[PDB]
Design a protein around this ligand. Sequence first.
Ligand SMILES: [Cl-]
Ligand SMILES: [Cl-]
Ligand SMILES: [Cl-]
Ligand SMILES: [Cl-]
Ligand SMILES: [Cl-]
Ligand SMILES: [Cl-]
Ligand SMILES: [Mg+2]
Ligand SMILES: [Mg+2]
Ligand SMILES: [Mg+2]
Ligand SMILES: [Mg+2]
Ligand SMILES: [Mg+2]
Ligand SMILES: [Mg+2]
Ligand SMILES: [Mg+2]
Ligand SMILES: [Mg+2]
Ligand SMILES: [Mg+2]
Ligand SMILES: [Mg+2]
Ligand SMILES: [Mg+2]
Ligand SMILES: [Mg+2]
Ligand SMILES: [Mg+2]
Ligand SMILES: [Mg+2]
Ligand SMILES: [Mg+2]
Ligand SMILES: [Mg+2]
Ligand SMILES: [Mg+2]
Ligand SMILES: [Mg+2]
Ligand SMILES: [Mg+2]
Ligand SMILES: [Mg+2]
Ligand SMILES: [Mg+2]
Ligand code: NA
Ligand code: NA
Ligand code: NA
Ligand code: NA
Ligand code: NA
Ligand code: NA
Lengths: 328, 333, 333, 328, 333, 328
Amino acid sequence: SFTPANRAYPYTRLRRNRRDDFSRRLVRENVLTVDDLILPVFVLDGVNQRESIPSMPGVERLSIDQLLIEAEEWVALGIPALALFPVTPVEKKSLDAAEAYNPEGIAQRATRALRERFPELGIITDVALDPFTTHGQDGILDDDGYVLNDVSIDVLVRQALSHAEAGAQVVAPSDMMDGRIGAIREALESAGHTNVRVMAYSAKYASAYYGPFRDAVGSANKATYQMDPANSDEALHEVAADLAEGADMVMVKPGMPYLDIVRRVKDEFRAPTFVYQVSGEYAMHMGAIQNGWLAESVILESLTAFKRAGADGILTYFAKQAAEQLRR
Amino acid sequence: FTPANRAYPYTRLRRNRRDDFSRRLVRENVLTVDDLILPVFVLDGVNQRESIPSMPGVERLSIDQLLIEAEEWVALGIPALALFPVTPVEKKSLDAAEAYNPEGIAQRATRALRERFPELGIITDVALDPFTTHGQDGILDDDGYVLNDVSIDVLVRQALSHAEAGAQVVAPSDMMDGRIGAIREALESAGHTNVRVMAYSAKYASAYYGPFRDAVGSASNLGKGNKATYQMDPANSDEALHEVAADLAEGADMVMVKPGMPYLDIVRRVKDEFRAPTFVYQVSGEYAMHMGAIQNGWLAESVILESLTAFKRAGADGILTYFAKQAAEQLRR
Amino acid sequence: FTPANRAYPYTRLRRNRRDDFSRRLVRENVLTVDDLILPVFVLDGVNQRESIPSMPGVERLSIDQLLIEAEEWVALGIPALALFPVTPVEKKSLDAAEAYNPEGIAQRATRALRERFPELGIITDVALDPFTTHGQDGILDDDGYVLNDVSIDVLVRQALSHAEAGAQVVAPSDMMDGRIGAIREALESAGHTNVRVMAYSAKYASAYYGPFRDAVGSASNLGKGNKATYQMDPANSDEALHEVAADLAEGADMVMVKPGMPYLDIVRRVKDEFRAPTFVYQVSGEYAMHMGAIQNGWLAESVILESLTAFKRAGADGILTYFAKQAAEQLRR
Amino acid sequence: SFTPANRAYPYTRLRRNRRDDFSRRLVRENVLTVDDLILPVFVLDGVNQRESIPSMPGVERLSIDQLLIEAEEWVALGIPALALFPVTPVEKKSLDAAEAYNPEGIAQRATRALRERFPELGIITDVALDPFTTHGQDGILDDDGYVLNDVSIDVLVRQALSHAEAGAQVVAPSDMMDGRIGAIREALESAGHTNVRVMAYSAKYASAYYGPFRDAVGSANKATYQMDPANSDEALHEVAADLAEGADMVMVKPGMPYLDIVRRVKDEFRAPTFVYQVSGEYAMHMGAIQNGWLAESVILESLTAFKRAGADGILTYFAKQAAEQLRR
Amino acid sequence: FTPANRAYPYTRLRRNRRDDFSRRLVRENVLTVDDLILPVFVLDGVNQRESIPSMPGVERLSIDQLLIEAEEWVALGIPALALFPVTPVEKKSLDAAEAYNPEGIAQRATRALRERFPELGIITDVALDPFTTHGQDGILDDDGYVLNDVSIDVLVRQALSHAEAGAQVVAPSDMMDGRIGAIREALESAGHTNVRVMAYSAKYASAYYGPFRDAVGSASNLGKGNKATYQMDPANSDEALHEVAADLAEGADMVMVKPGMPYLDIVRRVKDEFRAPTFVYQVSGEYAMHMGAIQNGWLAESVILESLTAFKRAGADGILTYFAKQAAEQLRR
Amino acid sequence: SFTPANRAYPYTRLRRNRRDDFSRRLVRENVLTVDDLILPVFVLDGVNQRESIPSMPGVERLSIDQLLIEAEEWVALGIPALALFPVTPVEKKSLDAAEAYNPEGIAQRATRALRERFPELGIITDVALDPFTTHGQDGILDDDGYVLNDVSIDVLVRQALSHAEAGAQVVAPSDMMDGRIGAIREALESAGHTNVRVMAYSAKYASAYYGPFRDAVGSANKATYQMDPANSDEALHEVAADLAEGADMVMVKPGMPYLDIVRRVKDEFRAPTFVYQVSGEYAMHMGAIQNGWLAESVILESLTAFKRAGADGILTYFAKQAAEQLRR
Ligand SMILES: [Cl-]
Ligand SMILES: [Cl-]
Ligand SMILES: [Cl-]
Ligand SMILES: [Cl-]
Ligand SMILES: [Cl-]
Ligand SMILES: [Cl-]
Ligand SMILES: [Mg+2]
Ligand SMILES: [Mg+2]
Ligand SMILES: [Mg+2]
Ligand SMILES: [Mg+2]
Ligand SMILES: [Mg+2]
Ligand SMILES: [Mg+2]
Ligand SMILES: [Mg+2]
Ligand SMILES: [Mg+2]
Ligand SMILES: [Mg+2]
Ligand SMILES: [Mg+2]
Ligand SMILES: [Mg+2]
Ligand SMILES: [Mg+2]
Ligand SMILES: [Mg+2]
Ligand SMILES: [Mg+2]
Ligand SMILES: [Mg+2]
Ligand SMILES: [Mg+2]
Ligand SMILES: [Mg+2]
Ligand SMILES: [Mg+2]
Ligand SMILES: [Mg+2]
Ligand SMILES: [Mg+2]
Ligand SMILES: [Mg+2]
Ligand code: NA
Ligand code: NA
Ligand code: NA
Ligand code: NA
Ligand code: NA
Ligand code: NA
């Protein structure tokens, strides 16, 4: 913990280390690097296609060919990994979310293309039913319109397996179903996919910050599976379970509104810990920068906060801008 | 923490989430009006109201207008205001003498509020940059560096002038070393036994302060010194513990982390380690980015209470927030 | 630590190791140029460069040559130098007066560097043995023992002379009790408010110092006193905590563990318990044994960055290392 | 943890205990003894054979008969145990590492000879595939040249069993395969080898310090199984797993470059904890001593550091020299 | 502690116990001669040796005889002696003046030993009851209670007299509050900078002291006051922490728990919480009961090393033991 | 843990509470009561029989009828429980320790008699093979003379079951076999003896203090199962295992020489914790009291130490004397 060691003014003046750039640099506790950045990308069905997102200024949905073009720069900048989010055509959506495990679904096609062209680039696929359900709910519904836990997991498992077969190095189960990490881990192990990583969305909150992402993927009672914003202790039980079930990495979502949770998770478990700077966080910052209300320097400051809080890796729509600034 | 071997399917964390009643039972934290502090920008003159473009919905108010608005703040049960005077350009000087003028805006406003609303807490701002022509946070040496101890001598006089005006709380916001002890020693020696000191303990060198600078007219002074010689490096967490430990030893009744949401890990650490009354400032940048996104239709209004709930969950006792009135109103209902 | 019941085959720790990208994501620590301090050996005279056989690739440099080399150090972004003067035999005395001579090598070098490279940190060495004829680390009593408090009176004058020369940091390296407090009190009383003190807190009685002694010409004095009466016994871990606690109470801005790699457990304990800016010296012996093995072809060059990464993993904020330039160059690329 | 107890100069002067030899001796926190030393030995195939190792000055590879001769002195000095490393003849190397479990392999022959002649001397055998593969990799390779985890374990298990049958009191699995301690433990238990100790190489790093050992055994992507030098938290998960799987002792490797890891491991688990002062550490010290750059006293100082850090036992090529100095 | 889910039959704790070599490897603690302090009873006169019936094998020795025996103690490497003078009845007084007599037994013995055996540590006993006619541990008020502060004034003079005689360590054994600070302040003011103070910090009101009282002739004074007004209640554990914390703050270089084996939990707590040099006294009662049982043939001689190993396992750095010579001899072999 | 709270002389004087009996009584942290005492008793085969034990002054071996007589007083004094140790006739000793589970063995006969006459008195039976083996070793021997772990457990299990059938409320497995608590617990549960307590000898050391007990029971390499006196951390692993295996109470043995272990065990596990003040401890104290070297008050002081260290219950040959003093 912490021992103040009887430090007292004027013997102790904390301004001394702050006096010069060189000593500030020497004592600086944390630094952000390109190794910490994961770029989420919205993937379209077509060819030679890009779309602008109204609530995410500067962010484009990209067909796979456009994705391959942009990825050259992302690789050149040293961005270790992408998180793929397909924009599913409405005709492919169903009550059984079968498109989730379609070997020729966008996510699967995108993964195969990227694994071939950029063998060193990390590909993190999204294991979730809501891009594929007609109702846009995060799983299979019962008569009452409730999301069924275990039946939803059966689909997630087939989906995760389809992603491993496409070559994804990481699968990221994002729908907050209980026990899903264990079921997905059992299935990957039994199928011989020993080295496929599982990045669990462990402490994912029922948040208003997800607004712009719903515009991005075309999907605009979550309180029955996503966490209540008020709860902190509960996040520890979520992470403990996912680690026991075999997650290689655990995530807190949203990010900056939940930095205390990041801190508690890294302190308690000492495991690889990730944080999602969500679409609302990006849009809030971008909106204030374009309005000329905040300096562009808030981008790096916001990312530094994640590192200081204990995060190993950050999912951020700012990943390319950040990488550029870090280099130059 | 002990996980107690909890395992799916015996443990399913969705069961408590199934219904509103059980979510309510297990809910770990709640925000109330008792948690809110409203910062207010105070003009000289009479019948003055000015909109702040970078802070949509926030007005600078002359004192007469402040008193009128305060009726509604008190009616909503908001426990305290933090006063930030908008100092006329002509009253800035090298020596920051306006800081301790009994007829300064902060002193006049404090006297008016204390008389009109005796139960409303008034938190005054103990700082020199509103009163310096160069806009730096203290008195400069011949190298252009802020002199620590000389600045404190001015801060002390100012804090005493606030105590004399009736302020229940003084909040020293310029990051000078040892200033909490010096101000406390002066308050004690002068008989102001119960004047609270709310220390800005862990206050970071931040880009989130942009709109406040627009509100008080300081933005064009930013380049004329280096705030990194006293404000904390955003990278530093352990250092916050040392800041807080010193302010508690020096007599602070409350300790504060500034900025807010970008520093929620620091709020957590500070509350966990010291178990003291812990405050957090949701700064002008944070307000602006939320407001901009809400006005754009990019974010639902519900993000306001989500952002404030976060401060409570992280361990804060009170939150200085430009959303205080909007929040109290929703609460309230 | 809670293991969280992780069990093979559900948990396979090789999955994160499978690819470079995932290794990069989970990597816990990185070394940067911000972490490096270069010690330099400083000669009297002009156009002097001398190779040190027991430290392959290290040169003692006259000040003119130091300034020339410093251009490259600054260009690589190395934040600071630690200066070690090579005192002429004739300037050694019983009273160590050369320590505080404004025209001593350390003072002249500091003044030259501060003028030429204003942003480069200069860490001076506060110690008496470079200036004593007997080569012991302080002033001797009639029993041949180093007098604690009398030595401190000389160290104080020397630290003041460094502050007057412009040094941003003084580093008291002779293990006298209470010396941090005495030097700090003197700096404060004289107005050197911002002069940092980098305490050699947990400095051990070590055989790894051999080559440094060759560098500064002290090897033949080793037998003339007992360093074990002030330097720490290598067996003692708990004792380091007490050393550091005292130096922090006495005002050190940074605390240091010496030797480095053979004492990485101490770095860990010190960082864990105090959460303060923590420094480590990768001493001359450590440099020499790595260099000797690399030159022999017994070890790959990559051991340099491995050794330095270890300091970061153990909890060090900064590393004093004769590899600083070689490391910065690799980094850099 | 730690309470400074308001100790202050001049009331507290830490030099007082340092004043005289007798009080230094009284407060000395740790002492190295011969009980802490394990001697690694490189074992040749022949008779009347010894070889010098260019990068390990003073260290000889020894035929088993020479080993028996030298062991008399090691036993007389009180060295509790040897760690055997066979120097496999190139003709015995294969893709299936079958020589690993050959009842007449060097390790097995050496063990039987030593167990008979010096019944009280601890014998620690090396459970590893790399001395036996043609490719010198630490396991069985797939098409991509990747080391297969579970298939490699199947061989390790047969090897460990062959060592128990030869009489080894300890087997030491050194190849960083996940779950191998558990598999080896299952097999030893099922075969009735209840008392055979398992000394797990738990936190073994992807290190440059292993250079001279590769010269010693004739073997000059490890990053896919050996630990990244940057990682500390990760070492706790490695040790927790090996303890749960049944290790009687856990090891950190390299040694002095990883003393912080030794400290964390002993503090967290309070289990028998070992550390390997590797070939590079030995060569670095020996090179500087022979160059006359460092006093021979660094040997004892380096070993003292392991004790102070929390190690119960130390694998060190300095074991005989250290034992001699400790006695005389 | 984390159990790490270890479970039979995967974990069998008998495997490490199977052979001597593996037992040796995992052995957590060892006793060495460096851990031993021998208490010795010192007579006035010349050519005096007296057997102590309640302490079989222990002799009181005149100084000449002490010096002769000390040759063997030094040859075995025993680091220090604790001296306990057997004060002649005629030299006891109300004012305990004999305590600070430069010609007292303790002072004479210290001077003789320091000259003859310069490397042997001498720990003198700072206490008043050997010098009072009533045998109570300090100066009495008119109610028959030991006056705390007045007793300290005598203890200080005595500690100074020991420092002047050459003692490297003084050990204040009478349980007066604040005595460590007062003695340290006096030693510091007088220039005895390096005289160690070994505090009897947590010393209990014990029945195990019986035979020592026979050794020094105090048994018949026990009823003439109440030791429970300064010695600790055997029931109290938390209280020991407060005793030790105070003695460390007051400047003790070593802290001690008394009795020994009946208080091994206290040794553990004290070492765990303070991480300071920690000593334990295996008192006369403990020696006597072991000796009696060994002489009876009820216990094997091996219990001696078992009892001493316990002190090391519990966290002691050094052990004051009447078995020191017997132990060193076995060790040794 | 502990906060000194800046307490300083003369503001703090710890002698103040020590000034008067009443305040000493108020702050007294621990008190010994008759509820803390368990009396070990040596039980003979005959009728109207008692024997004196040379190395345990004042202690008698008693036939069951004499035991019943003495038990009236023990019950009247409030002693909660006895620990029975039969003195097995040499003719009943064997290589297979079959007498251990004889329904008419001394322990079984004694238990049935006491359970009937004093239904409220706790009876703690000894689950151990050494009173029943010809060789007096603590289990069944292999060819090498080593005590077999799992084969010894098979006998212990039958013995524990015979004690439950005789009515013993507690069985106390005293032989240091690994896993025995679990095996005994499995067997008691399967047989329907749900409420039979298991008092594990968890941290039992290879001690010289057991001498007089061996005289008492007629039995004068234990280092291969009993704990090395030097080891403390190891005791935590012993207790953790016994608790997981189902022990209702855990014990440290010897007692006063191991009070630090008592402290660590109670602090770490917060479980019912017992300590054995062994025969050597009793004889040492009794010998010094009879010699007139120590006051009889050491008896209470020695017992107080166990309470202060964290023990809930104490096995002590002083139980009747202590009970008498506590009452009067
Ligand atoms: Cl200043
Ligand atoms: Cl500021
Ligand atoms: Cl001195
Ligand atoms: Cl030194
Ligand atoms: Cl008094
Ligand atoms: Cl006393
Ligand atoms: Mg979803
Ligand atoms: Mg979950
Ligand atoms: Mg990190
Ligand atoms: Mg300011
Ligand atoms: Mg401050
Ligand atoms: Mg702006
Ligand atoms: Mg709260
Ligand atoms: Mg020096
Ligand atoms: Mg010091
Ligand atoms: Mg040399
Ligand atoms: Mg660090
Ligand atoms: Mg290998
Ligand atoms: Mg492993
Ligand atoms: Mg150890
Ligand atoms: Mg006394
Ligand atoms: Mg005291
Ligand atoms: Mg007596
Ligand atoms: Mg110890
Ligand atoms: Mg037995
Ligand atoms: Mg056991
Ligand atoms: Mg209790
Ligand atoms: Na990272
Ligand atoms: Na509140
Ligand atoms: Na750094
Ligand atoms: Na050892
Ligand atoms: Na010791
Ligand atoms: Na009890």
